[PDB]
């Protein structure tokens, strides 16, 4: 107990993570410190058609460009246009206040650690690891429900335009899909 307490005190970030994972019932303290220690002849027909069309070729001047086309191209290339999109998270350094940013970084670190444990468990070569991956998935789901859902609610309340949760969802969805695919393979191997 005394030895365990001093480790948390030296790293408050880990202490905050320890509370966010153990007190919130996401993971057990036993598992917490365990890890720490082409087509048909129509193509030839089209080729012949274009050959005949370009057989009688004459240069043109007016048809090459028009005032409307040039204006549209300039508008597209003007600052703030489609190709010149000037927003690109205008003030993301000051958007989504740093109080949320610190929480986002903590969530990123926690998700990275959990996924690192999951991928270290992968590939599953022994039946012992099968339960461990299921426990990791359960811990991931509990952490998501505990933190990301309030995080999403806070983001929606403040109406932040950045899709910060989207990347976290992408990694979690990828991990879930990989686990489901591996389980499907495991079922197929037993057939």
């Amino acid at each position: 107990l005394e030895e365990k307490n001093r480790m948390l005190q030296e790293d408050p970030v880990l202490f905050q993570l320890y509370k966010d994972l153990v007190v919130s019932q996401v993971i057990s303290a036993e598992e917490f410190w365990a890890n720490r220690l082409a087509t048909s002849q129509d193509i030839i027909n089209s080729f012949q058609s274009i050959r005949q069309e370009m057989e009688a070729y004459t240069p043109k001047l007016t048809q090459v460009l028009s005032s409307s086309a040039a204006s549209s191209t300039i508008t597209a290339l003007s600052p703030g246009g489609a190709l010149m999109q000037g927003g690109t998270q205008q003030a993301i350094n000051q958007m989504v206040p740093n109080d949320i940013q610190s929480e986002l970084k903590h969530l990123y670190v926690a998700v990275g650690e959990l996924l690192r444990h999951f991928w270290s468990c992968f590939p599953v070569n022994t039946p012992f690891l099968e339960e461990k991956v299921v426990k990791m998935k359960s811990n991931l789901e509990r952490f998501q429900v505990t933190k990301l859902c309030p995080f999403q609610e806070k983001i929606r309340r403040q109406y932040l335009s950045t899709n910060l949760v989207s990347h976290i969802e992408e990694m979690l969805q990828t991990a879930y899909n990989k686990l489901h695919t591996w389980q499907s393979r495991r079922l197929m191997k037993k057939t």
């Binding site: 970084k105 990275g112 996924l115 690192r116 991928w119 270290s120 990347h167 992408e170 991990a175």
Partner: protein, 380 residues
């Protein structure tokens, strides 16, 4: 007898005249002979390589405070080590570098064995303001290097480089037993001393198969490092050696699309300052982890992220371009336009590829053999 005590050389007898003006043909021949001064190979040395896990051991004793190399040994050594790391990572795509510093009869692993160039350079720059105290310990440094490299795969060439400034080393135990263990571990050890020759370093280099050298000046130091840059020759086929590595595409994000997803970089998350939450970067093909630098092994799934052009840049050595057959212009009964540059063929010799039987002038042949490394006709 002597070569210079015989007859005086008359080099001007080469030129001759038969039509009172044929010297133009002779000078044209001289100009033609002036070209093709290369062996049609940019390197001409080792045509292959092997993955190297190189460990650099740096002395941190009081002898590094000596001012033999301005301003002192430590600063010049660190600068040349930064240059060596840059060049080594440039010429070795999938190699790894670890750094160990010996001080006060102990060894500290300054940087983990990895392929990131920026991390090593940052650590070296941080180490400039270290404190030089105590005496070096070769035994501890070699023990740490062996322990780290003991579990490495056999196909990789395990190499250890020691920069030994002090002439004295404190060994807690016998060192020759450690040398025998290293020999059994097939670990190559090379030492570049600074002051003078030391018996133990020479014995270690001889037994481990490495090379021992002594620095004369900064230029000699740089030459020795450059010599150490080159990879060792590799056998034709050793084992089933392969590696699972990904090729992360550099997908940036734009706010024009609805998939503009900011993400903090894994490398930047460990920094004290606010990590760069850029629009996009390099996404891991396996776990979609975001990284800014390459080549960097993935922190999450352990996959190796490498850039395909870096690997492909050395592919021309595997399939070198055959030398074209030199044929005089008169004897070639065909087109008189170069197939590569469309220029008129006026030189006395025309080069014809053995595969596509095209025509290339001297300049185009040199360009193909030196830079292009591929025959334009064979591509078609």
């Amino acid at each position: 007898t002597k070569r210079w005590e015989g007859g005086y050389e008359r080099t001007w007898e080469i030129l001759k005249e038969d039509e009172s003006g044929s010297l133009k043909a002779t000078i044209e021949d001289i100009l033609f002979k002036a070209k093709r001064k290369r062996v049609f190979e940019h390197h001409g040395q080792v045509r292959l390589g092997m993955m190297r896990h190189l460990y650099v051991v740096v002395d941190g004793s009081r002898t590094m405070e000596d001012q033999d190399l301005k301003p002192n040994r430590l600063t010049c050594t660190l600068k040349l080590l930064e240059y060596f790391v840059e060049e080594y990572f440039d010429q070795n795509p999938i190699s790894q570098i670890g750094i160990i510093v010996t001080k006060s009869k102990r060894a500290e692993k300054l940087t983990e064995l990895s392929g990131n160039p920026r991390k090593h350079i940052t650590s070296l720059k941080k180490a400039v303001d270290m404190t030089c105290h105590g005496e070096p310990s070769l035994y501890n440094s070699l023990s740490i290097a062996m322990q780290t490299l003991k579990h490495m795969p056999g196909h990789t060439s395990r190499e250890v480089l020691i920069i030994f400034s002090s002439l004295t080393t404190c060994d807690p135990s016998n060192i020759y037993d450690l040398i025998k263990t290293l020999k059994a571990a097939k670990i190559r050890v090379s030492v570049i001393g600074l002051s003078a020759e030391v018996r133990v370093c020479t014995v270690l280099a001889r037994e481990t198969g490495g090379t021992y050298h002594v620095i004369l000046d900064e230029s000699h130091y740089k030459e020795l490092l450059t010599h150490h840059v080159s990879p060792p020759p590799a056998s034709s086929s050793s084992e089933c050696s392969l590696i699972r590595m990904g090729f992360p595409q550099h997908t940036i994000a734009s706010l024009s699309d609805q998939d503009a997803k900011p993400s903090f970089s894994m490398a930047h998350l460990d920094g004290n300052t606010e990590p760069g939450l850029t629009l996009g970067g390099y996404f891991c093909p396996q776990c979609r982890a975001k990284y800014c630098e390459l080549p960097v092994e993935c922190k999450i799934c352990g996959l190796t992220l490498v850039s395909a052009p870096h690997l492909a840049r050395s592919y021309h050595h595997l399939f070198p371009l055959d030398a074209f057959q030199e044929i005089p212009l008169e004897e070639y009964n065909g087109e008189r336009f170069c197939y590569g540059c469309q220029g008129e063929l006026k030189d006395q010799h025309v080069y014809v590829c053995a595969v596509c039987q095209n025509v290339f002038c001297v300049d185009c042949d040199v360009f193909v053999h030196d830079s292009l490394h591929c025959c334009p006709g064979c591509i078609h």
